[PDB]
Write a protein that binds this ligand. Structure first.
Ligand SMILES: Nc1ncnc2c1ncn2[C@@H]1O[C@H](COP(=O)(O)OP(=O)(O)OP(=O)(O)O)[C@@H](O)[C@H]1O
Ligand SMILES: [Zn+2]
Length: 358
């Protein structure tokens, strides 16, 4: 009945959704493993592909849509030379200091050519999977994912994202990113930044020339590590430690946005990565595990909402790893969309969150 009890009931509702998601993920993993084995046996530019087990499912914060999954296939590419396309770090061109020589447009790696060959090979090899009902969805223009359609008998879509892996040092645009020093610490930050980084094809949608061939940085591996190692204490949420409500707040906020986006197409510009980025900042601002005690679920959720509303008001939400990349810039999301979302969030906040019941 009370506000705090109603919020705990929403988490119970999300917990019940996880059984169907876990069962679908088992079917997805069977297909994905089968396909990866085929691509690893075939001789091609992609023989080295491996699954990167990242994203919301592997972070344990996939809260809905058991019929939709994303998987990332990483491919190590030695001797990558990056060129900033946007000097904020939002987009890069890939050049080389070559196994990928067939995909070059001049000196620039063509995502279009590379993805075309990736898709062609996936389609050939998926046709050889005989004991699962799986096909490749017809290509959609503007969608770089290669989408598998699995029938189990119900349809599950799996977006396969090709990611390049670079073992070089992280780009200079990330120099002041990952501001975890007061929370996870400087040794953790040093260790995380020695890991590879990833490049994911994404069209910049602007004054062209090399529109089509741009890539965005991806730190999905780092983000998974943070989600699963999120406490100032090493034992946070372990069997010999204390539970916190950090992930619960993320799930509630993701669900709030999902429910709002379902009702209002004015909110198309917003996505769950905005919520994830916001909570990364909130975990940096409030680093103590005691600031995320389970008994403070309601007040922690409310401070996350307040922080998100302030990001909307100031049209500023910096990418956690790329500080000059403003996800809420006027250029990327118009002012009226932010004011619309601010109005909806404030309504939910002051009226007991009726949209959770939808
Ligand atoms: N709009 C986006 N902008 C930047 N990165 C994004 C965006 N959407 C997804 N990502 C990338 O994907 C990861 C976060 O997405 P996630 O794994 O939660 O998938 P999802 O399909 O959005 O999840 P969910 O179904 O839980 O909402 C990060 O590695 C992030 O870099
Ligand atoms: Zn915890």
């Amino acid at each position: 009945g009370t506000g705090p009890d109603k919020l705990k009931k929403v988490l119970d509702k999300l917990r019940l959704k996880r059984k169907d998601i876990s069962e679908a993920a088992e079917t997805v993993n069977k297909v994905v493993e089968r396909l990866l084995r085929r691509m690893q046996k075939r001789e091609s530019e992609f023989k080295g592909v491996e699954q990167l087990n990242t994203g919301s499912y592997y972070e344990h914060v996939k809260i809905s849509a058991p019929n939709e999954f994303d998987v990332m296939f990483k491919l190590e590419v030695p001797r990558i030379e990056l060129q900033e396309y946007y000097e904020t770090g939002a987009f890069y061109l890939v050049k080389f200091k070559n196994p990928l020589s067939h995909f070059l447009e001049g000196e620039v790696l063509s995502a279009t050519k590379m993805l075309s060959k990736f898709r062609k090979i996936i389609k050939e090899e998926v046709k050889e999977i005989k004991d699962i009902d799986v096909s490749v969805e017809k290509e959609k223009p503007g969608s770089p994912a290669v989408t598998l359609l699995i029938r189990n008998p119900e349809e599950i879509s799996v977006d396969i994202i090709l990611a390049l892996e670079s073992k070089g040092s992280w780009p200079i645009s990330t120099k002041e990113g990952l501001p975890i020093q007061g929370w996870l610490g400087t040794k953790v930050r040093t260790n995380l930044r020695r890991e590879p980084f990833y490049l994911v094809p994404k069209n910049a949608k602007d004054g062209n020339s090399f529109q089509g061939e741009t890539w965005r940085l991806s730190f999905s591996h780092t983000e998974k590590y943070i989600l699963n190692n999120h406490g100032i204490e090493k034992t946070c949420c372990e069997s010999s430690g204390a539970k916190c409500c950090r992930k619960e707040c993320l799930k509630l906020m993701k669900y709030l946005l999902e429910q709002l986006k379902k009702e209002f197409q004015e909110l198309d510009a917003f996505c769950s990565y905005h919520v994830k980025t916001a909570i990364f900042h909130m975990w940096t601002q409030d680093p103590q595990d005691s600031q995320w005690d389970p008994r403070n679920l309601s007040s922690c959720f409310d401070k996350l909402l307040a922080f998100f509303l302030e990001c909307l008001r100031t049209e500023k939400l910096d990418h956690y790893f790329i500080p000059k990349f403003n996800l809420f810039s006027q250029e990327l999301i118009d002012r009226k969309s932010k004011e619309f979302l601010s109005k909806k969030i404030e309504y939910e906040r002051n009226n007991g969150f009726p949209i959770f019941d939808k």
